[PDB]
Structure formats: C-alpha cells, structure tokens
Amino acid sequence: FEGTFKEMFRRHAAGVAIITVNYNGTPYGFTATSVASLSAQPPRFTFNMARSSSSWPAIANTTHIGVHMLGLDNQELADRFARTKNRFEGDHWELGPYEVPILKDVAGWLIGKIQMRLSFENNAVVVVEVVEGQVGEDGTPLLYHSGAYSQPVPLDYEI
Amino acid sequence: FEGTFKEMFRRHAAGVAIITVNYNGTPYGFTATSVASLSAQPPRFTFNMARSSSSWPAIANTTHIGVHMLGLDNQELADRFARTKNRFEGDHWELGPYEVPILKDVAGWLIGKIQMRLSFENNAVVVVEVVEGQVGEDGTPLLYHSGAYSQPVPLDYEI
C-alpha cells in the first residue's frame, strides 16, 4: 500500500522543469516533475517539494523564484539539478530579474512571486504568481517516467 | 505575457489521469494533467482545477474521490473525460470503495479523502490523502503535450 501508492506514481509520467531561487545571495535550484498550471488570470503555477530538500530553506524564506521548462537538449541540466553536486558550478546560468538565477538554453522560463506554501510534515505545496517570463528555443519537451528521461512521440492520428 | 505563460505551459508535457467523484449519487469525473505526488507518509497527491468545471460542485461538496493513471490503451477514455458528452454513459466503470466511481481497464487507481481545497477566484488546488488503491495492467503511460496525446519513448542510453 505504501507500495501501491509509490507504484502508481511510478506509472504516472511527467514533464521536467527546474526551479531556481536566490537565497540571500547564494543560488539554489532543483529539478521538479510537479510543476502544473493553476490559473490564467492572474497567471499561477504550483509545485510540490520536500521540506528536507537542500533548497527548502531558500524557498521558505524567499519570494521570487524561476521556473524553467526543459527540452531534450536539456537532459544534462535536468540530471545536474537532481543530484547532489554543486548545481551552479559552470557557466550555464546568470542572474536575471529580481536576481533570480536564470538557466541558459532552456525551452523558456517564468519568474514568479511565491504567494504561500502549504506545509505538511515533510512536504509542501508551493503556489507562485507569475510576474515575468520569456520563451526560449522551441524543441521537444523532456519527460521523466519510471526513473528515465523520455521524449514524447505523438500517437498515430489519421487527422 | 498572457501569451508567454500560456505558451510555456504548451511546452510543458504532462501525464494523463482521470479524477472521479460521486456527488450524492451521480458520478462525475474529468481528465486531468496536474495530478502530482505530494507525500509518502501519509500518502498524498495534489491536482488543480477550474471552479467552472462541471465537476467543481462535486469536488467542493464531496470527500472521497478516485484518481486513475492511464496507459496508451486508455486514450479513448481520456478523450471521453475531457469532452462535454455524458462521461459515464457506457459499461466502462463501476462503484467501488466509498461509492467512488472506478474506471475499468486503467493502469491503476487510488482512492483518497480530500483534505482541503485552496480556492482562488477561478481555480483551486485540491489536496487528497490516499486511503486505498490497486495497481492495474502495466503498460506505457499516456502523456499529453501541446494539444496531443503522446507516448513516452526513452532516450538512448548506452547503459
């Protein structure tokens, strides 16, 4: 049952984004599969994270964040931002609006103000209102499913 | 900018689930691309929906709901549950635990109790604690991206 729940989400595919935050001068960021649209007017999105993430204190104590949509050419960056090594070592980012860390060469990004976090024991829902953004290079979205990075192939359609 | 936000989520792929609820005897349900894992202990998931959904009153006023993970063989059911026709016309479901409508032949389902909804002007975040579930037939997950149902193909790996 702990099993059934973990299993069913193993079977649920997801798109891959990266969240960035500048916590009093130091950049933090992390790969995320829970980013979802919430509303259009005003524009908002949500994601979930663990309060044990190395980035939780940055998120708890900061207002502006970035979200980055990833394509297939961004798989290395996705893996970077999911592992424990220093994620900002390299020339792959720079500070943008509100001093949010902006990652180069992504499908596009949005900058938001965190409205609130809804915190449970070990995880939180984060609600963000979007204040800025920029479309990047169009490409094929990056997906993650049962532990592997994947690409979407549309299903046959006669049209 | 209304554009940039709508565009960036066009570029963000997603897995496809269906949410079902029994509102005082009548089944309601809807296809959803925002279902995400929140926590493991206790097990919880989140999704977002529009307060103008035909299913909002069911969700606002009911506690038990079902979520169904979909495979490629479930594309017709996904489309059913996204369109305005009577979604429960046919022999493709039955009442399960807590009288939740359970859809047949899916990748698996979970039953949850809605803890709360966080309601904005036109949309809400719904937080659900999982109380029951069952793995269905393993298969390939269904994805939805820029208006089309897709399948995930893993990216090449030398291993």
In this structure, the strands spanning B36-40 and B93-95 are: unpaired
Which tokens in the block code for residue A90?
Answer: 């390299």
- The amino acid at residue B90 is G
Strand order in the sheet with A36-40: A26-32, A17-23, A64-69, A108-119, A123-135, A43-50, A36-40
User: Would residue A129 count as lying in a domain?
Assistant: yes
| Residue A29 within any structural domain of the chain | yes
User: Considering CB atoms only, which of A33, A75, A125 is closest to B125?
Assistant: A125
A36: closest CA of chain B, how far (Å):
5
User: Which of B58, B61, B47, B116 lies closest to B87 in space, CA to CA?
Assistant: B58
The CA distance from B111 to B98, in Å, is 9
Q: Contact, B132 vs B110, CB < 8 A?
A: yes
Total Cβ atoms within 10 A of residue B33: 22
Count of domains for chain A: 1
**Cross-chain Cβ contact B48/A33 below 8 Å:** no
Contact A130 B5 (CB under 8 A): yes
User: Would residue B110 count as lying in a domain?
Assistant: yes
Q: Given an 8 Å threshold on Cβ–Cβ distance, is A152 in contact with B155?
A: no
Candidates B155, B111, B152; CA nearest to B14 is: B152
Q: How far is A27 from chain B, CA to nearest CA, in Å?
A: 23
Q: Which residue has the tokens 């049209």?
A: A159
Phi, psi of B136 (to 5 degrees): -100, -150
> B132: how many CB neighbours lie within 10 A of its CB?
18
Q: Looking at CA atoms only, how far is residue B33 from chain A in angstroms? A: 8
d(CA B152, CA B130): 26
Query: Is some CB atom of chain B closer than 8 A to the CB atom of A156?
Result: no
B150, B17 Cβ separation under 8 angstroms? no
Signed CA dihedral, B56, B60, B61, B64: sign only: positive
Q: Do B39 and A121 touch (CB under 8 A)?
A: yes
Element spanning B43, H or E: strand B43-50
Interatomic CA distance for residues B148 and A2, integer angstroms: 33
Per the structure block, which two tokens stand in for A76?
A: 């290395």
Contact B68, B135 (CB under 8 A): no
Phi-psi region of A89 (alpha: psi -120 to 50; beta: other; left: phi over 0): beta
Stated resolution in angstroms: 1.9
Tell me if chain B has a CB within 8 Å of the CB of A119: no
Measured distance CA(B64)–CA(A103) in Å, rounded: 41
Q: CATH code at B2?
A: 2.30.110.10
| The two three-digit tokens of residue B98, written as one number | 């807590």
Residue B66 · residue B113 · CB < 8 Å: no
Domain membership flag for residue B10: yes
User: Is residue B29 domain-resident?
Assistant: yes
Task: Say which residues have a Cβ less than 8 Å from residue A15's Cβ, sequence separation at least 6.
Answer: A33, A35, A69, A70, A141, A142, A143, A144, B12, B13, B14, B145
Q: How many angstroms away from the CA of A104 is the closest CA of chain B?
A: 15
Closest CA to A138 of A44, A75, A93, A73: A73
Q: Which residues pair with B22 in a beta bridge?
A: B27
Method: X-ray
Residue A63 sits at the chain B interface (C-beta within 8 Å): no
B51 occurs within a structural domain: yes
Distance CA B33, CA A38 (A): 11
Give the structural domain span for B105: 1-151
User: Is B8 at the interface with chain A, CB within 8 A?
Assistant: yes
Among A8, A107, A148, the residue with its CB nearest the CB of B154 is A148
CA A103 to chain B, closest CA, distance in angstroms equals: 15
Residue A159 lies in a domain: no
CA B114 to chain centre: 14
Whether B159 is in a domain gets the answer no
Residues in a beta bridge with B43: B40
Give the N- to C-terminal CA distance of chain B in Å, as an integer.
42
**Between A4, A38, A141, which is nearest B125 by CB?**
A38
> CA triplet B116, B119, B122: central angle to 5 degrees?
145
Count of residues for chain B? Answer: 159
Yes or no: say if A153 and B153 are a contact pair by the CB < 8 Å rule.
Answer: yes
